[PDB]
Design a protein around this ligand. Sequence first.
Ligand SMILES: Nc1nc2c(ncn2[C@@H]2O[C@H](COP(=O)(O)OP(=O)(O)OP(=O)(O)O)[C@@H](O)[C@H]2O)c(=O)[nH]1
Lengths: 50, 49, 292, 76, 99
Amino acid sequence: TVTNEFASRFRTIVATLANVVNERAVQDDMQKATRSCTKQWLRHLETQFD
Amino acid sequence: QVGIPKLEVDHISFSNVVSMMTANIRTGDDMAVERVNPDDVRAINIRNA
Amino acid sequence: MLQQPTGGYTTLEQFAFTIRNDGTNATPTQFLQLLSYEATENELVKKTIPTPETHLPSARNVPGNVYIEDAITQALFGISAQNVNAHGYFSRLSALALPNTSARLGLDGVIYNSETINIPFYDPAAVANFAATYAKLGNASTPRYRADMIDIYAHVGLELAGTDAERAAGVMPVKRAKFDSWEGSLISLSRDVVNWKILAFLIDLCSLEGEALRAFKTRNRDVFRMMLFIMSTAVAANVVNRKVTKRVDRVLEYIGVNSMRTAGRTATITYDLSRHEFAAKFLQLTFTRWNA
Amino acid sequence: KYPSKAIPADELIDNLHSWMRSVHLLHVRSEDNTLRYNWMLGVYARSTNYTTPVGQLVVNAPAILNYSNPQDAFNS
Amino acid sequence: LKKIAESFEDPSSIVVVLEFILFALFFPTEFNRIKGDIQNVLLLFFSRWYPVEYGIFVQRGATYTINAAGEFEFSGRNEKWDQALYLSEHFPALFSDVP
Ligand SMILES: Nc1nc2c(ncn2[C@@H]2O[C@H](COP(=O)(O)OP(=O)(O)OP(=O)(O)O)[C@@H](O)[C@H]2O)c(=O)[nH]1
């Protein structure tokens, strides 16, 4: 009635991608910034997808 | 027997097989490409190659 | 389909190997009589040739009938060939390597993908044997499989210049070849060789076995030596003429030493680096087959 | 600082010691007994301050400096 | 594939990966046609983000061929995919799903 298997698959996809973006070591400060911004934006794409 | 090469001997030969490219070939025409600049100048590496 | 005789395909008059010389179609043996050798202080010693890799390169899906004989003979003796590895059509030989393939290798020296009318072609078993070794010309360039291109020429020397005692010993003095010569001799020799249907020689070299094979090696030794000669001039460090009292003696130095030269010269055909890798691989395979 | 006489041992030990404190090679320690540490690449990456591609590779994946087979230390 | 230039330095470069993942989902078939060509971009990604793993993986080989009885045979050698390979026996190895 409620859950959509496709959307949930995308949810685990962006959770994986967020873990990967998270574990991505960087040196420049702006890189360190866009890491977290990337994380937010993935988190938004998930809602668009659902 | 192989044929005697024409340049090897002094007789003139007025028929010969010239290779020629067809309409399908075309050499020397200008050609187009997409060029893609590096995203950040500071990311470009020189050494160690 | 052309039947293969009890002797090789080379026994057929259709596949005669003959350089031009003195205004006639001289056989290679009677050109090699003209060759004479000045031994120098250096010594060639033949190392064991590494066994050719088991791997047969993939024949990429190619619709066309690849002219392979032309590709090979140009890669080894072509005056103007270069970048003989950028195209990678030698891998196509592997298409013939399969048992019961629909492909056939024509006497024209083209690899047709299917049997086709009015085009004579070698017996597929023999060609399967030939492809099973010479497809590896396809990995002449691949970094994992490149042949030694320095050591191998020692064998070339031994098989070209080496006296029967030197060939038995496995070591000969580095030699400097010479012969009375016509203008542009090495070029015309190299092209008389380029026109040779060497696929016959190779298919007989790979398919024949037993006494019939060994009788081949003796019958065709001078031919193989001529290929070795063209190739050795291709890598010879220098190639002068000598005045000899109203006669001219061409002198290539030195046999068996690959100078690794790549810059061109009027005197001889020249190997680009790709051609060096290719010739090295070809020598590796052909010599591996010539000793067994 | 000492054109004429030998550098006094106290100054040599003190300064060399402080510089020794100053150095710290990148690494990821691990339990495997077969492992070594590609010291050449480690010190080199350090000396460039990790600006060469080898330096980036080391600064991002220090574990790459560890090696069992000595040759694969570089092939990696 | 319309080729992508990405060099995968900034974390945001992950976007290209996502653009592929989404393409795998919405169009699994067409993705299957262009997948080697996308594997070329992915390899630039993996060589940056996971160099040690990329080392072991590429060391197994960049491609493979299924044989009789269906077993995979990986190339043992890194090399760029070309669509010239789509009609050949070879598959991009990134999609083998072999642990
Ligand atoms: N920067 C750097 N260079 C090294 C290192 N290890 C060896 N080398 C250099 O590698 C070169 C050749 O390596 P080795 O064969 O081990 O040294 P060598 O040729 O026997 O000569 P020596 O180094 O004087 O003992 C030498 O000239 C060294 O300077 C290292 O850890 N870091």
